[PDB]
RNA sequence: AAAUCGGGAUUC
RNA sequence: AAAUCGGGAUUC
C-alpha cells in the first residue's frame, strides 16, 4: 500500500468520440481513459476520495488545458511518462503538481479561456431558396440590413458552375439510385465551393464587432438553458474577445478563424450560443448592436454551435497563485506549457476538427438546418419584436 | 495488392459503450472496431465495395450472433485468429465463410432470434406512493385486475425493514449533504430488497401467457415508431416465444429470466416495446388478453425497454442454405457455434449486463420513471379506453 | 456533466 | 442504424 498525495493534474485532450470530461459509465469519457492510464501506470490502485475537475467539458468538446485534483501515488519519478504511455494519442497529461489540502478545482478557478474554431464559409449568407433567405430578403418592408454582395457573388458563381455541369437535370427531392448519385455530386460541388471561399476584410470586421458586443458584464440568460432573466447568477463578465485572422489548414484547404473568449465564468453552452448568435448576426447582415437586445428579458432560443469547434483553452487560478505562493506551493499556470499544447493542439485537436468538418460537413449541416426552420428567425429580421 | 473474395463474417459482441452495429463516425461502433481489427490483421487495406450487415443492432444492443458481408483478403490461413487478437475482448469473430456474388445479408435473412434478459424484480408491482400504483389501486370503480399479494408482501417487508433502521427521519425530497447520505442508504436498501426477490410460479406463468399473446401474425404498429396502422408492412409474424426459468447470476445474486423471441422480421425497437408491454401487463395485474387490444388502430405509446438486456441471438438464412447448398457454398448456421457463443455470452455479455444493472440500476430506474408519469397508463387500468 | 422516456423539426 | 437543433417529463 503506497502513499498518496493530493495533487493537481494538468491535461489536454481532443473530445471527439468521448462523452465529455466527467466520468460517466458506461460510456467512455476523458476521465475514464485517464483512470485506466493511471491504473496501468501505477498512479492509483484497485468515489475516488476527493476527486475534482475544473471544467466539465461537454460531449465532443476538446481542451488544450484542463485540470483535475485527486490523491495520486507520486512515488514513481517517471509516473507522468508512464501515464502518457498508457494513454491514447488524443489525451495527454501536461504535468502533475502538489496542491494544498483545501485545493478545489472549481472554487479556485478565477477565469476561463475558450477557443472556437469556425470555418469562414459559416459567415456566408443563407442559400437562395432557404426560408431564412426568403424571410431576410423579403424584409424590404423596412428598408436596416446589409446588402452583402459578397454572398450574392458566391452563390451566383456556384449557380454558374452548377449549370455548367448539370444541364437542367435539376435535383428536386430524395428520401443506390442514379438520381442520388447526381444529387451527391451537386452537394459535393457546393461543399467544394464553400471550401474555396475566402472571407473579405469587411465581413471579418463585422464579425469582430458582433463578438465585441459581448465584452463586459451582461445578462446571458438567453445564452444558456434553464436560466431565468431575473436570476442574479445569470449575469456573466466577459473580460476579452479576440477573433484571429483567417488561416487555411488541411488537405481540402479550408479557411478558419479562431475566437478566443476570456471570461470570469460561463454557463452551460454559453460559448457555443454566443458564437452561434454572432455568426447569425454576421451572415444575415444585421446591426451588431442588436446582439445587446438579446440581453433583454424577452426569451430567444439561440441554437448552440457545434461542439466540434470548442476547446477549453485553460482554466485560470489567479487567487490561488497570488495568495498561496508563500506556502511553497507551485503556481498553476497553463501558459508554462503553451508551446507543448500548441503542438498537440495542431496534431491531435485541430486536425481532427478539419477532418471531421470535411468528412461529415458538421458546420454546413448545422447552418443548413438553421436556414430552413420556419424565435431566432424573427430576431434576425430587420424588425425584431420590440 | 492482394486478391479479395466476397465472404460473410460471423461475429458476436457486447454492445455496451458502442453506438450500435452500423459504422457511424466519429462515434465508435461495432463495425469501426471490426474494421480496425481487419486493417491491423491484414484482412483489408488502406464505401467499402459492397459492405453489408444483417441486422443494425441499436445503441447498447448486444448480439450473440450477427453477420456481415464484404470483400476480404482471405490469403492468410490464420486470418481469423489475427483479427481476434486485434479485437477488444467484447467483440469476437466466430467464423469467415465464402458466399456467392448475389449474397445479401438482409434480403436473404429468413428470420431472427432475439434474447432479452430481464431481472425478475421488474415484475413486482409499482411502489406504493407512485402515480401508477395510485391509479391502479384506485381502479375499484370497476372491481378485472389481479390482487398480487406477492408485491404487497414485498413492499410491506421493505417498509418493516426501513422503519427498523430509519426511525422516522423519513426522506422527503433532494435536489455532499448528510440528508443525501441518508437517502442514499434508503435507496440502497430498497435496491437490496429488489435483488433478494424471487419470483413466484404464478407471476412467471402470468408473464409467460402475456408473452404468448404475441404468437402468430399481428399488427405491431404500436410496437415501433413511425408506422401507420393501415400500412401492410406493419404486420409481423412471431414464430415462437420462450421464457426461461428464473436463474440467479452475479455477486449480488440477482434473479433473471431469458425471453427468446423467434420472428420472421422485426420493426425498430419492436422487441423492447413487446417486452416492456408484457412486463407492464404482468406487474400491473391486467388480463393478458388486453395485449391483443394493442393491435387495434388506437395509438398507444409503449416505452421501449432498456437496450442493456437485448441480444440479437442469430439471424437465420433458411432459403440460402436450402437453395444454394448444391452450388458448393457452405450453409450459414450460427448454431454450429452455439457452444462457443454460449461461453462468450456468459463471460463478456451477461456479466456486463449484471454489472451495469447492479451499478447503475438501469431497469429499476426505467420502471420508476414509468411508475411516475401522470396513454399507457390508461391501458394498464381496469378500464382501457374502448 | 452525462444518461433515460417519449413527442417535434432536420441531416449519407 | 447513428447523429443534429430545440421543446417536455425523469434519473448519483
Ligand atoms: Cl463545454
Ligand atoms: Cl436493435
* B304, closest nucleotide (Cα–C1'): C5
Contacts of A70 (CB under 8 A, 6+ apart): A6, A7, A9, A44, A48, A49, A50, A51, A52
Task: Say how far residue A122 (Cα) sits from the centre of its chain.
Answer: 14
Q: Which of residues 358-377 of B touch strand C (CB under 7 A)?
A: 365-366, 369
Distance from CA of A99 to the nearest CA of B (A): 22
Closest CA of chain A from B25, distance in Å: 8
Could you tell me which chain B residue has the CA closest to the CA of A355?
B26
Residue in B closest to A353 by C-alpha:
B26
Strand partners, B241: B261
The Cα A219–Cα A223 span in angstroms is 9
Burial class (CB in 10 A: 0-12, 13-18, 19+), A186: middle
Class of domain A114-312+362-379: alpha beta
In this structure, the number of other CB atoms found within 10 A of the CB of residue A327 comes to 7
Q: Which CATH number applies to A5-107: 1.10.3720.10, 3.30.1330.60, 3.30.70.580, 3.90.1170.40?
A: 3.30.70.580
Closest CA to B100 of B336, B332, B327: B327
Residues A305 and B198: their CA atoms lie apart, in Å, by 50
What 3-state DSSP class applies to A296? coil
Find the chain B residues whose C-beta atoms sit closer than 8 A to any C-beta of A.
16-17, 25-28, 356, 359-360
Task: Give the Å distances, CA to CA, from A60 to A20, A273, A344.
Answer: 6, 16, 17
Contact B16 A28 (CB under 8 A): no
Using CA atoms, how far apart are residues A34 and A49, in angstroms rounded to an integer?
A: 16
CA of B361: nucleotide with nearest C1': D11
Nearest nt to the A365 alpha carbon by C1' = C11
**φ and ψ at A308, to 5 degrees?**
-60, -35
Q: How far is B194 from chain A (nearest CA, A)?
A: 22
Calculate the CA B298 to chain-centre distance.
26
- Closest nucleotide (C1' vs CA) to A27 is C2
- Residue A170 to residue B134: CA distance in whole angstroms: 60
Question: Is strand D less than 7 A from the beta carbon of A304?
Answer: yes
Locate CATH 3.30.70.660 in chain B: 116-309+360-379
**Looking at chain B, which residue has its C-alpha nearest residue A47?**
B176
Burial class (CB in 10 A: 0-12, 13-18, 19+), A293: middle
In chain B, the residue whose alpha carbon lies closest to the alpha carbon of A308 is B26
Q: Work out if B20's Cβ lies within 7 angstroms of strand C.
A: no
**CA B28 to each of CA A8, A27, A167, A313, B69: distance values in angstroms, whole numbers, following the listed order:** 30, 11, 41, 26, 20
Residue nearest to nucleotide C10 (CA to C1'): A369
Residue A56 CB in 7 A reach of strand C: yes
Stated in angstroms, how far is B343 CA from C10 C1'? 43
**Exposed e or buried b for every residue in B131-151, given b needs 16+ CB within 10 A?**
ebbebbeebeeeeebbebebb
Inter-residue contact B293 to B379 (CB < 8 Å): yes
User: Which residue of A17, A26, A356 is in closest CB contact with B28?
Assistant: A17
Between the CA of B306 and the centroid of ligand 2 the distance, in Å, is 11
Helical segments of chain A, H only: 30-41, 79-85, 131-137, 149-163, 178-195, 201-212, 270-284, 290-293, 318-324, 338-344, 350-360, 362-371, 376-379
Nearest residue to C7 (CA, C1')? B301
- Helix residue ranges, H only, chain B: 30-41, 79-85, 131-137, 149-163, 178-195, 201-212, 270-284, 290-293, 318-324, 338-344, 350-360, 362-371, 376-379
* Residue A156, SS3 per DSSP: helix
**Residue range(s) in chain B whose domain bears CATH number 3.30.70.580:** 5-107
- Which residue shows C-alpha cell 428598408? A143
Rounded Cα distance, A97 and A325, in Å: 13
* d(C-alpha A95, C-alpha A93), whole Å: 6
The CATH label, of 3.40.50.150, 3.30.420.40, 2.40.10.10, 3.30.70.660, for the domain at B116-309+360-379 is: 3.30.70.660
Backbone dihedral region of A138: left (phi > 0), alpha (psi from -120 to 50 degrees) or beta?
Answer: alpha
Distances (CA, A) of B203 to A357, B124, B132, B137, B381: 54, 9, 19, 18, 18
Buried b (16+ CB within 10 A) or exposed e, A15-41: bbbbbbbebeebbbbbbbbbbebbeeb
DSSP string, A350-361: HHHHHHHHHHH-
Half-sphere exposure (CA, 13 Å, Cβ side) for A52?
18
Nearest CB to A26; choose among B16, B25, B28: B16
Residues 158-187 of A with CB under 7 A from strand D: none
Looking at chain A, the domain(s) classified CATH 3.30.70.660 span: 114-312+362-379
Resolution in A: 2.4
Ramachandran bin of A299, using left for φ above 0, alpha for ψ from -120 to 50, beta for the remaining angles: beta
How big is chain A, counted in residues? Answer: 386
Output the nine-digit C-alpha cell for B184.
Answer: 442514499
**DSSP symbol at A136:** H
Amino acid at each position: 500500500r503506497l502513499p498518496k498525495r493530493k495533487v493537481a493534474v494538468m491535461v489536454g485532450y481532443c473530445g471527439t468520440g468521448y462523452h465529455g470530461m466527467q466520468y460517466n459509465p458506461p460510456n467512455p469519457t476523458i476521465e475514464s481513459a485517464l483512470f485506466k492510464a493511471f491504473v496501468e501506470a501505477g498512479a492509483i490502485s484497485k468515489k475516488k476520495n476527493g476527486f475534482m475537475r475544473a471544467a466539465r467539458t461537454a460531449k465532443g468538446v476538446h481542451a488544450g488545458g484542463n485540470l483535475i485534483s485527486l490523491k495520486m501515488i507520486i512515488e514513481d519519478p517517471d509516473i507522468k511518462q508512464k501515464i502518457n504511455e498508457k494513454l491514447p494519442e488524443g489525451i495527454r497529461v501536461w504535468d502533475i503538481e502538489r496542491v494544498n489540502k483545501a485545493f478545489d478545482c472549481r472554487k479556485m478557478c478565477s477565469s476561463r479561456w475558450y477557443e472556437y474554431l469556425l470555418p469562414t464559409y459559416s459567415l456566408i449568407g443563407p442559400k437562395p431558396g432557404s426560408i431564412l433567405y426568403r424571410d431576410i430578403e423579403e424584409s424590404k418592408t423596412e428598408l436596416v440590413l446589409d446588402e452583402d454582395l459578397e454572398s450574392k457573388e458566391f452563390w451566383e458563381e456556384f449557380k454558374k458552375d452548377a449549370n455548367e455541369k448539370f444541364s437542367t437535370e435539376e435535383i428536386e427531392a430524395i428520401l443506390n439510385e442514379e438520381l442520388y448519385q447526381k444529387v451527391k455530386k451537386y452537394k459535393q460541388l457546393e461543399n467544394a465551393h464553400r471550401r474555396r471561399y475566402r472571407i473579405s476584410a469587411a465581413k471579418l470586421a463585422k464579425f469582430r464587432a458582433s463578438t465585441s458586443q459581448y465584452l463586459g458584464a451582461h445578462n446571458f440568460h438567453n445564452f444558456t438553458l434553464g436560466k431565468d432573466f431575473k436570476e442574479p447568477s445569470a449575469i456573466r463578465f466577459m473580460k476579452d474577445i479576440k477573433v484571429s485572422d483567417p488561416f487555411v489548414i488541411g488537405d481540402a484547404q479550408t479557411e478558419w478563424i479562431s475566437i478566443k473568449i476570456h471570461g470570469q465564468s460561463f454557463m452551460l453552452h454559453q460559448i457555443r450560443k454566443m458564437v452561434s448568435m454572432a455568426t447569425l448576426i454576421t451572415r444575415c447582415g444585421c446591426p451588431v448592436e442588436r446582439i445587446s437586445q438579446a440581453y433583454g428579458q424577452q426569451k430567444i432560443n439561440i441554437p448552440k454551435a457545434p461542439a466540434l469547434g470548442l476547446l477549453l483553452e485553460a482554466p485560470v487560478f489567479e487567487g490561488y497563485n497570488k495568495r498561496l505562493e508563500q506556502f511553497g506551493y507551485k503556481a498553476i499556470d497553463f501558459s508554462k506549457y503553451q508551446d507543448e499544447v500548441d503542438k498537440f493542439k495542431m496534431k491531435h485537436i485541430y486536425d481532427k476538427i478539419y477532418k471531421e468538418e470535411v468528412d461529415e460537413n458538421v458546420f454546413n449541416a448545422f447552418f443548413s438546418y438553421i436556414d430552413s426552420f420556419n424565435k431566432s428567425i424573427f430576431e434576425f429580421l430587420t424588425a425584431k419584436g420590440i
